[PDB]
Amino acid sequence: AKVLVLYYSMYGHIETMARAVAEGASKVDGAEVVVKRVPETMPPQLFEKAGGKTQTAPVATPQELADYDAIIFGTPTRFGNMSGQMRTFLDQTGGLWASGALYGKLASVFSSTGTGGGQEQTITSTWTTLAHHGMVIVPIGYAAGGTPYGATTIAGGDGSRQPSQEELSIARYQGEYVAGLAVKLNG
Amino acid sequence: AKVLVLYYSMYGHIETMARAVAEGASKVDGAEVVVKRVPETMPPQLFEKAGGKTQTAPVATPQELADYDAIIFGTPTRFGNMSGQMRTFLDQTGGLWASGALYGKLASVFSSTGTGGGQEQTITSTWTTLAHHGMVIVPIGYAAGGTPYGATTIAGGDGSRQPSQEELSIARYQGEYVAGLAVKLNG
Amino acid sequence: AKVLVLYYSMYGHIETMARAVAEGASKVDGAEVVVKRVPETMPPQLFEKAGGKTQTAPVATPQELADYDAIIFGTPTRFGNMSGQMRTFLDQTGGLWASGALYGKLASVFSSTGTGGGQEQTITSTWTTLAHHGMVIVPIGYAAQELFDVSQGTPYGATTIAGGDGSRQPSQEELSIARYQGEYVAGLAVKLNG
Amino acid sequence: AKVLVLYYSMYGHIETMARAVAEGASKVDGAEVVVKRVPETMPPQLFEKAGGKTQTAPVATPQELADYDAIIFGTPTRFGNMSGQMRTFLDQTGGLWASGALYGKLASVFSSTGTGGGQEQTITSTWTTLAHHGMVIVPIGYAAQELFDVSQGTPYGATTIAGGDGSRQPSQEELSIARYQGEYVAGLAVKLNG
Ligand SMILES: Cc1cc2nc3c(=O)[nH]c(=O)nc-3n(C[C@H](O)[C@H](O)[C@H](O)COP(=O)(O)O)c2cc1C
Ligand SMILES: Cc1cc2nc3c(=O)[nH]c(=O)nc-3n(C[C@H](O)[C@H](O)[C@H](O)COP(=O)(O)O)c2cc1C
Ligand SMILES: Cc1cc2nc3c(=O)[nH]c(=O)nc-3n(C[C@H](O)[C@H](O)[C@H](O)COP(=O)(O)O)c2cc1C
Ligand SMILES: Cc1cc2nc3c(=O)[nH]c(=O)nc-3n(C[C@H](O)[C@H](O)[C@H](O)COP(=O)(O)O)c2cc1C
Numbered sequence: 001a002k003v004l005v006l007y008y009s010m011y012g013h014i015e016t017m018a019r020a021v022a023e024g025a026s027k028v029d030g031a032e033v034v035v036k037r038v039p040e041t042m043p044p045q046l047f048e049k050a051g052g053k054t055q056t057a058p059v060a061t062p063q064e065l066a067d068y069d070a071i072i073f074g075t076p077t078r079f080g081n082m083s084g085q086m087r088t089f090l091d092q093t094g095g096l097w098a099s100g101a102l103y104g105k106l107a108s109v110f111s112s113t114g115t116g117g118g119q120e121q122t123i124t125s126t127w128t129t130l131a132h133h134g135m136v137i138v139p140i141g142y143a144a145g146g147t148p149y150g151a152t153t154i155a156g157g158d159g160s161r162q163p164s165q166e167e168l169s170i171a172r173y174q175g176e177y178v179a180g181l182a183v184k185l186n187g
Numbered sequence: 188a189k190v191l192v193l194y195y196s197m198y199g200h201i202e203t204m205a206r207a208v209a210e211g212a213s214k215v216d217g218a219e220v221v222v223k224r225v226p227e228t229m230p231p232q233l234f235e236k237a238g239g240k241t242q243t244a245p246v247a248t249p250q251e252l253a254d255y256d257a258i259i260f261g262t263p264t265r266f267g268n269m270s271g272q273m274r275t276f277l278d279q280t281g282g283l284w285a286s287g288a289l290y291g292k293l294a295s296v297f298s299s300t301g302t303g304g305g306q307e308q309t310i311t312s313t314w315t316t317l318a319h320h321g322m323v324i325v326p327i328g329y330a331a332g333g334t335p336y337g338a339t340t341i342a343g344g345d346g347s348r349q350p351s352q353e354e355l356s357i358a359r360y361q362g363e364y365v366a367g368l369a370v371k372l373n374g
Numbered sequence: 375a376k377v378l379v380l381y382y383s384m385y386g387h388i389e390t391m392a393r394a395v396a397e398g399a400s401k402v403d404g405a406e407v408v409v410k411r412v413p414e415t416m417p418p419q420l421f422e423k424a425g426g427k428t429q430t431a432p433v434a435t436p437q438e439l440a441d442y443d444a445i446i447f448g449t450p451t452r453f454g455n456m457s458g459q460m461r462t463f464l465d466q467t468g469g470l471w472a473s474g475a476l477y478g479k480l481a482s483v484f485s486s487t488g489t490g491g492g493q494e495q496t497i498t499s500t501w502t503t504l505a506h507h508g509m510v511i512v513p514i515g516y517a518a519q520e521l522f523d524v525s526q527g528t529p530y531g532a533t534t535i536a537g538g539d540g541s542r543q544p545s546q547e548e549l550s551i552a553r554y555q556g557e558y559v560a561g562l563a564v565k566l567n568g
Numbered sequence: 569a570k571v572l573v574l575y576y577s578m579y580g581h582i583e584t585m586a587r588a589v590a591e592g593a594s595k596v597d598g599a600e601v602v603v604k605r606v607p608e609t610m611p612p613q614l615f616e617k618a619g620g621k622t623q624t625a626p627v628a629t630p631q632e633l634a635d636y637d638a639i640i641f642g643t644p645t646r647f648g649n650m651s652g653q654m655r656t657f658l659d660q661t662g663g664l665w666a667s668g669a670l671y672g673k674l675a676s677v678f679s680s681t682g683t684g685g686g687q688e689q690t691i692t693s694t695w696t697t698l699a700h701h702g703m704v705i706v707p708i709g710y711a712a713q714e715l716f717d718v719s720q721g722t723p724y725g726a727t728t729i730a731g732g733d734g735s736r737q738p739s740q741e742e743l744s745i746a747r748y749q750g751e752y753v754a755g756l757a758v759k760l761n762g
Contacts, residue, residue: 084655128689268456315453
C-alpha cells in the first residue's frame with residue numbers, strides 16, 4: 001500500500017512532525033511511504049520578511065494524490081482552520097472530486113499550534129473537505145496538548161522551539177497506525 | 188464481519204432509514220447485520236403527549252457495541268446536534284472508552300431533518316464522539332437534500348410524510364458500502 | 375438586563391465555574407444575575423454511587439429561558455459534545471424556538487474537561503444549537519490582560535481541567551477567565567437592553 | 569456605525585449576495601456601508617480561462633478591517649470550508665489579532681454552494697476564525713417572516729444555490745434573506761456603536 005504524508009509548514013513545526021509521521025508509517029512492512037509538501041503561495045520575499053523556514057521536500061501536484069492508498073495531511077493551526085496554502089491546494093483537487101479518485105482512500109490529519117487553542121477545529125474542519133472526496137477518516141483516539149483527532153505539537157509561539165519527544169512519538173504512532181490500515185485494506 | 192445499525196427515532200423517520208441501511212448492509216455476503224435502538228428517555232406519557240411513534244426494535248446496551256466490526260448510527264437532527272437520547276446513551280459508553288473496545292472499528296452516521304438545516308452539523312458533531320473512541324469514520328462522499336457526510340431524509344416537519352425513494356436508496360448505499368469495508372477489514 | 379447562568383455539573387467543576395461566571399456578571403451595574411441548573415437525568419441512587427455532587431442551585435424549566443436577555447451555558451465535555459443532560463434539556467426548547475423566544479438574545483458558553491481533549495468541539499457544537507434559536511454568540515477571544523482579575527485556553531469560552539481522576543479544582547487563573555466571561559457578556563447585555 | 573461587507577467570488581454568486589447584504593444594511597439610518605473584495609490569488613490568465621467573473625468592488629487590505637464596527641464575510645463553499653482566497657486573506661490578519669483590533673466587533677457570514685452540501689460547515693468553520701479575533705458572532709436563525717421583503721436554508725447565515733453547472737442565479741427569496749442579514753447586523757451595529 002502507498003502512503004503519502006502531505007504537508008504545509010511555514011516555520012518548520014509541521015515539517016518536523018511530517019518526518020515523524022513518515023518514520024512511523026515506514027515501520028509497516030507492506031507500506032511504501034512518500035513525503036511531499038504543498039506549494040508555498042507567498043512570494044519568497046514575503047515569506048522571508050515573515051521569518052519563514054524554507055521548505056525543500058518535493059512539491060506535490062493536486063492530481064498525484066490519486067496514486068496513494070492513504071494520505072496523511074499536516075497543517076498548522078491558523079485561527080482554527082487549515083492554512084491558506086493547504087486550502088488553496090485542496091481547492092485545486094476539484095478535478096479528482098469529479099472523478100471519484102480519492103473515494104474510499106484513507107485520510108488522517110496532524111497539526112501544530114501555539115498555546116492559544118484551535119487545533120481541534122483545524123483537524124475537524126480539514127476532515128470536512130476529506131469527506132467531500134469520500135475519504136475514510138482516521139482519528140487517533142486515546143493513543144492521545146493532546147487530541148483524539150490527530151497528533152499535535154504545541155509550539156508555544158515565538159521563542160518557539162520544538163516538538164517534544166512525546167509529541168513526536170504520537171506522530172509516529174499515527175503514521176504506523178494509518179499505514180497498517182492501508183496495508184490491511186489494500187495489501 | 189458484524190454490522191450494527193444503531194438508532195434513535197421519535198417520529199419514525201430514522202426508524203425507516205435504519206431499515207434501509209440494514210437492507211443495504213445485508214447485500215454484502217460476508218456481513219452479519221443487526222438493528223437495535225437506544226432507549227427512549229422520555230417517560231411514555233410525555234412521549235405520547237408529544238405524538239411519538241412507539242419504537243419496537245430491540246434495545247441496545249452501551250456495552251454490546253463492542254461486539255461489532257462496524258456501527259452505523261442514526262439520529263434526528265436536533266438543533267444541529269444528535270438527540271438527547273443518543274447523547275445520553277453515548278455518555279454511558281465511558282467504560283468501553285476506558286478499555287479501547289471500539290478502537291479501530293468502523294463508524295458511519297445517518298440523519299433526518301425538517302427543512303430548517305442542521306443535518307450537516309448533526310452528522311459531524313456525532314463524528315467527534317466517535318473519534319474519542321478511536322473509531323474509523325466513513326462518510327459517503329459523492330454517492331450523495333444531500334450531504335457527503337452521510338445519508339439524510341428531509342421530513343419537512345409537520346404534516347410530514349416520508350423518506351423519498353432516492354433518500355432510501357442512498358441510505359441503502361451507505362449500509363452496503365460500510366458493510367463492504369467491514370468485510371474487507373475483518374473477513 | 376437579566377442574565378441567566380444555566381449549567382449542568384455532575385462532579386462540581388462546572389458548578390464552580392458557574393459561580394465564577396455569575397460573580398463576574400454581577401460586577402455590571404444594571405445586570406440582574408441568576409444561576410440555575412438543568413435537571414439531572416440519572417436515578418439519584420446511580421448518581422450517588424457514581425459520586426455525583428449535590429447542588430443548591432434551583433432547577434430551570436425550559437420555558438423560563440425566555441425571561442432573560444442573555445444566557446451563559448455551562449456544560450462538561452462529554453466526548454466533544456455537551457452532556458446528555460444539557461442536550462435533553464435543550465431538546466425541550468421547541469416551543470420557544472417556534473415562538474422566536476430566544477431570538478437575538480446573547481449567548482455564551484463555558485466548559486470543563488478531564489484532560490483537554492474535546493473542549494473546543496463541546497463549545498462550538500453548543501453554539502450550533504444557540505444559532506438555531508437565533509441567539510447572538512459571544513466568544514471570549516483573547517481579551518486585554520488588564521481585564522482579568524488575576525495576571526496571566528481557548529478563545530471560544532472559559533474552560534477548566536478536572537484531571538484524569540476528576541480531583542483537580544479550577545485554578546484562580548481559570549476562574550479569572552470565567553469571571554471575565556460573565557462580566558463581558560453582562561456588559562453587552564446592559565449595552566443592548568438597559 | 570461602519571459596516572464592511574467583505575467577500576470573495578469567482579463566478580459572481582457571492583458578489584450578487586454581497587450587494588444584497590449591503591442593500592439591507594443601507595436601510596439602517598446611521599449605518600455607513602462599504603463593500604470590498606479580497607484579492608484573487610489565481611493568475612489572471614487562469615482566472616479568465618476558468619470563466620471567472622470580473623468585478624468592480626475595491627480590493628480590501630487586511631489592515632483596514634480594524635476601521636469597521638461590523639464585518640459581514642461572504643465566501644463560496646469549497647468542500648465545506650471557506651475559499652483558499654478568503655483563507656489566505658484571513659491568514660494575513662495576525663497583526664490585527666495581536667493588537668486586539670477586531671475584538672468585540674460584530675461578525676456575520678453568508679455563502680453560496682453548487683448543490684447544497686457543505687454550506688453549513690463553511691459558515692461555522694468561518695465562525696471559528698472570527699472567534700479567535702474575539703468577534704461577536706451573529707447567526708440569522710429563523711427570523712420573523714414579516715422582516716423579509718419577500719413573503720417566504722440555514723440558520724447560520726444566508727446562502728444561495730449556483731447549481732451543478734454554476735448557471736443558477738440567486739432567487740428573490742434567497743436575496744431577501746441576504747438583505748435581512750445585512751439589515752439585522754447593521755441594526756445591531758448602530759445599537760452598539762451609534
Ligand atoms: C495566521 C496565523 C494564525 C494562527 N492561529 C493560531 C491559533 O489559532 N492558535 C494557535 O495556538 N496558534 C496559532 N498560530 C501559531 C501557529 O499554529 C504555530 O506557530 C504552528 O506551530 C506553526 O507551524 P509551522 O512551523 O509548521 O508553520 C497561528 C499562526 C499564524 C501565522
Ligand atoms: C427538539 C427538536 C429539534 C429539532 N431541530 C431541527 C433542526 O435543527 N433542523 C431541522 O430541519 N429539523 C429539526 N427538527 C425536526 C426533526 O429533525 C425531524 O422532524 C426528523 O425527521 C425527526 O426524525 P424521527 O422521526 O426519526 O424522530 C427538530 C425536532 C425536534 C423535536
Ligand atoms: C461520558 C463522559 C465523557 C467524557 N469525555 C471527556 C472528553 O471527551 N474529554 C475530556 O477531557 N474529558 C472527558 N470527560 C471528563 C469530563 O469532561 C469531566 O468529568 C467533567 O469536566 C467534569 O465537570 P463536572 O464536575 O462539572 O461534572 C468525560 C466524562 C464522562 C462521564
Ligand atoms: C474547489 C471547489 C470546491 C467546491 N465545493 C463545493 C461543495 O463542497 N459543495 C457545493 O455545493 N459546491 C461546491 N463548489 C461549488 C461552489 O460552491 C460554487 O462554484 C460557488 O458557490 C460559486 O460562488 P461564486 O460564483 O461567488 O464563486 C465548489 C467549487 C469549487 C471550485
